[PDB]
Ligand binder design. Structure first.
Ligand code: HEM
Length: 116
């Protein structure tokens, strides 16, 4: 679904059209903001340390692995999403690209079948 590109400081550089629909923020609004605006606490307040931690230790926890986490929309509603992260460099600086897959439907179907 969504594609997001951030610098080594967690600041959003590129925000795809699909991401706009998924998170509710427009491209102009999102750009120049910390990526932590797309997640809820406690991850939100710790995301910078997550990046900092990786930039020094170089031990990936999601990069090359992938993980299912909770995303937070503009209207405050949260949702499950699969997150894949890629590391790249441009202009001698590190950039991270995140590919997001909305799993809202999957989760709803699973809960529904469990309820019946
Ligand atoms: C919107 C929901 C998101 C949540 C809830 C989330 C959550 C997390 C978590 C839990 C970690 C640390 C994992 C651990 O310590 O075990 C992490 C690491 C990281 N996040 Fe996010 N994140 C989200 C989106 C993104 C996006 C869109 C990017 C942008 C490309 C991103 C880039 C990173 C980077 C670079 C790391 C460190 C590299 C690594 O640990 O492999 N995150 N994030």
């Amino acid at each position: 679904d969504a594609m997001i590109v951030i610098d080594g400081h967690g600041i959003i550089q590129l925000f795809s059209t699909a991401a706009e629909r998924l998170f509710g923020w427009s491209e102009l609004e999102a750009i120049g903001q910390n990526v932590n605006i797309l997640m809820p606490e406690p991850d939100r307040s710790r995301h910078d340390s997550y990046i900092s931690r990786y930039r020094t230790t170089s031990d990936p926890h999601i990069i090359g692995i992938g993980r299912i986490v909770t995303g937070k929309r503009r209207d405050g509603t949260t949702f499950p999403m699969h997150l894949s992260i890629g590391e790249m460099q441009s202009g001698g600086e590190p950039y991270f690209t995140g590919f997001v897959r909305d799993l809202t439907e999957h989760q709803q179907t699973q809960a529904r079948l469990q309820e019946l």
